[PDB]
What does this fold into?
Amino acid sequence: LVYYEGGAVCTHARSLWRLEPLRISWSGSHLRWGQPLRIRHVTTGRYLALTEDQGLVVVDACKAHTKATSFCFRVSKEKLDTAPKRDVEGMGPPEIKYGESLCFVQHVASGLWLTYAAPDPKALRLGVLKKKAILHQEGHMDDALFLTRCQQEESQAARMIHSTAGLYNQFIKGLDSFSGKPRGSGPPAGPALPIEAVILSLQDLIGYFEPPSEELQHEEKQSKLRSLRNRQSLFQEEGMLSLVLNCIDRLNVYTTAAHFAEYAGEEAAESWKEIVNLLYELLASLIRGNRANCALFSTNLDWVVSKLDRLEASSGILEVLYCVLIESPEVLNIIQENHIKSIISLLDKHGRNHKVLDVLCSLCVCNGVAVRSNQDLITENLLPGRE
Amino acid sequence: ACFRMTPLYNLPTHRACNMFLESYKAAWILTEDHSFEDRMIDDLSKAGEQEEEEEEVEEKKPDPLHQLVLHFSRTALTEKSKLDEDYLYMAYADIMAKSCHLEVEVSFEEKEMEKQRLLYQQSRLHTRGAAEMVLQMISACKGETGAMVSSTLKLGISILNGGNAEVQQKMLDYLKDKKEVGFFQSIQALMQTCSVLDLNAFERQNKAEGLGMVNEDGTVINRQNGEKVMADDEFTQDLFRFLQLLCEGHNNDFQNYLRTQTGNTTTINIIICTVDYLLRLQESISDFYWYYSGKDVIEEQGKRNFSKAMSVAKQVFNSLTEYIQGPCTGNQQSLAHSRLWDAVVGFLHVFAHMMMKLAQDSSQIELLKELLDLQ
Amino acid sequence: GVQVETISPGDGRTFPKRGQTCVVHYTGMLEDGKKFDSSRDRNKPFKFMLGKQEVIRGWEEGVAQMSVGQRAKLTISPDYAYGATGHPGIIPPHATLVFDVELLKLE
Amino acid sequence: MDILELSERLDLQRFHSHTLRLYRAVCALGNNRVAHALCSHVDQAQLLHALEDAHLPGPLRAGYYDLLISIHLESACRSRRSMLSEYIVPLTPETRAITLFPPGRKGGNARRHGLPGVGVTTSLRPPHHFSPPCFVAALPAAGVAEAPARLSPAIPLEALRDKALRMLGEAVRDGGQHARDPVGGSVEFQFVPVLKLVSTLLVMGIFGDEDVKQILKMIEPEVFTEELEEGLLQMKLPESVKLQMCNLLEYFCDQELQHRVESLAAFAERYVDKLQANQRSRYALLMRAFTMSAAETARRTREFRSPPQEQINMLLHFKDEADEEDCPLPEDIRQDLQDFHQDLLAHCGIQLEKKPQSLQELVSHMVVRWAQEDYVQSPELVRAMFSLLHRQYDGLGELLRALPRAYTISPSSVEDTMSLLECLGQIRSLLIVQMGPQEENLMIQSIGNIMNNKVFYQHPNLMRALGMHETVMEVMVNVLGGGETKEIRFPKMVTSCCRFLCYFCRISRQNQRSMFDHLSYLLENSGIGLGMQGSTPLDVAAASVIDNNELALALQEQDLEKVVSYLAGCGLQSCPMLLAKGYPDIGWNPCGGERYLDFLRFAVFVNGESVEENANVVVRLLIRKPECFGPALRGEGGSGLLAAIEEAIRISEDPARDGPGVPPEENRVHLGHAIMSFYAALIDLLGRCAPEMHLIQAGKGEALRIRAILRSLVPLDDLVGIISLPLQIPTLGKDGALVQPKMSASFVPDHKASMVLFLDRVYGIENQDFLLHVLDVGFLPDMRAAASLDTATFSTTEMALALNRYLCLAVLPLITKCAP
It folds into this structure.
């Protein structure tokens, strides 16, 4: 469904759209009033379309058939459509400007005009900023739409989110297929998982989210930090974080690569550990330095602590927890004795690591504020034993 | 009440001492003038022994003033949700702004000499990144009015006074190479915040002054509150004077940059924003004139409020004039297609009627003169 | 309870009386052998008046049996001592306490 | 092992350093209990040995230094630094002796500065408090959060300071030798810890005059000689060491400023004594010479007629010498002030050799030379050095900014002022840490102690200078923000935070204005207050606005719009705690609506008169959002106000509608009472918004419009019906056991009083027939009821008292008005 909305959605990716002219050649030509085209949602990959059953919607490419998905930009609602323009080679005249032209979107076949539905009862009571978009014969003055540029970084991020979501959902589906089915003394007999693609995507995304070097000059480093924060926020809003968590859970159900192999096979078992480590690293990269993304774990902190004992990705899980604790006071407030004891047990079981001490230190104080309960719990649990 | 007003000798000692503290502070310390800005700037500008090393010429290490400018630019560039107030930045910006200007017939020789001295004093700053720091702080404020942005604007005006082409070029080059929308977004937000005459606030202040209740502490008759009507007039004049100075000298490049920013993903038209503020001010002035229309004689507070409004409108007119002068044809066309005509119509109406009214009473001659100069 | 074993003898004639301040040096160890307190490290003798309840029962009764110049080892069960609640950070719950106490003087 | 083996054993070194870091974290920010616990794991002997140990690695050395500071010194230094900004100077002979410059041959203006940090300081700083570390002590039986807060562990300060001086001197001497085996492996690891300890001790006030002199000589002997070895400033140092030097110089500049303030206070004492004597003599002269000339005599008396502050200002207004003659004071008294002013200007350096010869010159040259010698890579050091430079260049402005925080008190008030200072120190400490039950008990105890203290009443300007109300607001709002959405934490502490702020506004207008300035922010946090029982930030705002026409007129629109939006939301949905408790679901929240309505009442109506400026706006906003009016008065499909009251009475009678009907507090909400109170408050607000008679008479169109709008909203018949509505009355039955109505669940006379006010201000009573109608229907029955209740059993009943108040307040005055 399509809505008019205001707020952070303007910064977000899901408000992004791509214009695709029908002609393949010179598709990058200057847009022209009355030019038929298709409107694609970058992240989902879906195309704006008119469907008899649900009117204005976004549909898949397979369903798109150039009559539902064909739209044109019109300077004025008055419609003559006496002569269709001829196909033109080259870039052509620069008719439509960014941020200046007022454009009405018209569905070519029906001739209907894109417009807001108008509030349904109790919507005005809520005051919600969402106004469903419809195709209507008359519409209103206000229907005119400005077109605004999108940064290359953000467009690339939207496309990357589309591809990553598709790949990771396919991977999750492959896992769920044999979740409860042991292959036995035989193959799993299901579609091969995309292990190499997942590994490469994780590596590329980690490099994508890598923080700027400390040796870097201050202004450039600040610019990189901004870009990184915006990119983290976009991925989070489109839900890649939750997808990573789901993949991690599906992989965690299996204790070891052999236990994984009994369900998926050795050829995936070798990459199991690499994939879990890469997933934890990607999670840490996404949430590192991001207050909101680190705060999200207030709802599920047990998700991180429960997994600390696991050997395969101990360091990655610990880094994730360290990032969360440095960033989010909320987590500190919701800490409990069970979590503190689990971390102390991590010291006992995995040896003397100063990173655990740094985690404990972060628990005590955040941004000039001390948590007395956490301080006292750490003291009472760790110190008196003296071992 | 006066009988109860005790002679100070009856007053307890500690209360009297505190009263003496406030009185001495106001009468003596504030009245005392001490100028350390020029000396401080010279001391910081001087770099010592670098010629003695003779490698410092190849190295070009910053001088102390350059380092301070770099520190403030670092603070501005630092990524933050909000710009925290820095009394240090405020004080140092005041010091530099003072140093630059450091201000009945004058010879051409003399005028040229003062121009040259001001250019040197401005060079002390803009050779050391002061212009870039000013732009960075305006971008950092993100449209929130404050003492920080006031000091930044004052510094910019101080370095730009006389239409310094070199400062203009530095600012424009920095903006074009950075390609950041935050600067003009902040300017637009600041204009939107800039206030106009409010008849309700004027009436409330009049009621308060009329009451003039005695304060329980001591006695304060007719107590006065901070000016409600157009309190940010100094900030408004500073902002529009900064914008004017940027285009001063018929700098077509910066004029066209204000109209549109080609490289940037989004564009803001400062000329149209100025026109909108002028229209709002004109509406306020028209309403306030209507309020005083039946009344035979405007009172003193009304005269002061008119004077503030007309000074602001004068600065706005000068800024628009400076945008279009040179001439800049694009700015001319934009204004021709803007609402400036409606603003001029309202201003002419107010001018005519207030002229006729003010002519009637001689005490209103100064306000009439200001009105005529505004026309 | 309190078990007292003489490390070094005292005078054998002077014993603390109620309302009489006892000045001591002590070194505090848990039964495992870990030291948690010592007045000698601070270099300042610890003074406590008998019968106020400033110190734990173990100290009260054990010093009651001691004499001037006497050095003794006092073993105090948790019941005498801080007990199940313990002394957070310092002493675990249900910890027997071993003290090396020298009764320097009475005042 | 020997801990020195960690030089080669690096992993253990990192682990132990981070262990010390953890110790510091757990004892951080006032956890004195944890500090006492840590005293066992790391003892005083260990810490001192580490301080003196040359062979330790730098991480461990610095960690042990910082651990010592955290356990023993950090909290004390924090409290002292918090107090240092203020300058409360008692009037004593010690204060009197203070002079800008120290006695000598040279003239005060040209006469050489005294050494910083040396002399007499009379400003009040609360003493430090420490507790010995003992682990054999009896465990308090009292439960946690009730026991008094533990003090920081004790450390022998005289030994520590002597040791710090000796170690700093040895470090200076060895740095002079430029040896290749520095303590900690670096000049930084050597110098930084000692300097931090010394600065902490200075701020804490441990060092005396002679040791301050020793430190000053270590810094620079030539400048600080009083009437070879190389000083730290000349040594050549890394940036961190320079930063510690900057902190020390900061302290000494603070001391110079404090000395200036104290000297000014002493001069004020002496000068005020002289001026008071002279003024007394002059008024004796006047009382003798009134016979000579009446007019000039009266003109001179005008002085004594002026308030004392004006008299002082007039007497001091003789600087320009143009107003010299008008000032009555003699030339000698004037000259004393002139000489003091010149001496103060000289002290600040305003009056204008290579060798510095002064702290200001030393600091300025040192900063400039550092910047010239190297491009500083530490922004913290850059900020510190340039800030200190600014102070040296403009001391006088620094004094100007410090003066508002200077206050003079009699020595008699010293003990109470110190108690207040302690309480304020605890409150300030509470800011940094997250709130818990113990911190709440402490905050409440401190607030109660402050209220008990007289200085809180006698010296409100001192409280405003101290910024104590702002601290209370910050604590309150942090607690409201924490768990804001889910449910309100520490309602008791928030209630105390009003009682304090709300009383503080009551004390003085200037306090009320100061809280008015933050009004909006209080209103931003108010949203939860509707659910909140007891005092709330909305009540704080009401105190800020109450009975001050100036503040009411200064009040800005957007605040009223925000209140009206909250009120609408109350009219639109129900509160989620009543549903959680099981209360029957309804559309709207009458309780929160009532809260916002009485706030608007206090805003609009002041001292017996309506403020039309706010009232007209309130009416416009309410008509724009008619949900505030209630589901009754809705318009389409809306039951009238009288029917709403009747339905509320039926609900009150019927349980499962008043409440869940499945209360230790007994304040449990009763829906009928809540609805009736909401409507009564709305009617009262509208009647108060109603224009005044004299405006009506003048014929002002806006006033007529407002009255017509109010009349359209509320018809007269509904008001008369509500006034006629019966009120339950106490009776005796079944052995005479008093059957007495429950007020919180029943219709009450105040509900009728609101309607009476509306009728008087809006509709009025002009005709005998209507007056008689009202009397027969509603008033006379209630008066008869009150009189009948005027018996021994019933006289003190709550209903009888309510009826008497309702009558005297609303009805009887109206009958007196309509008597003709």
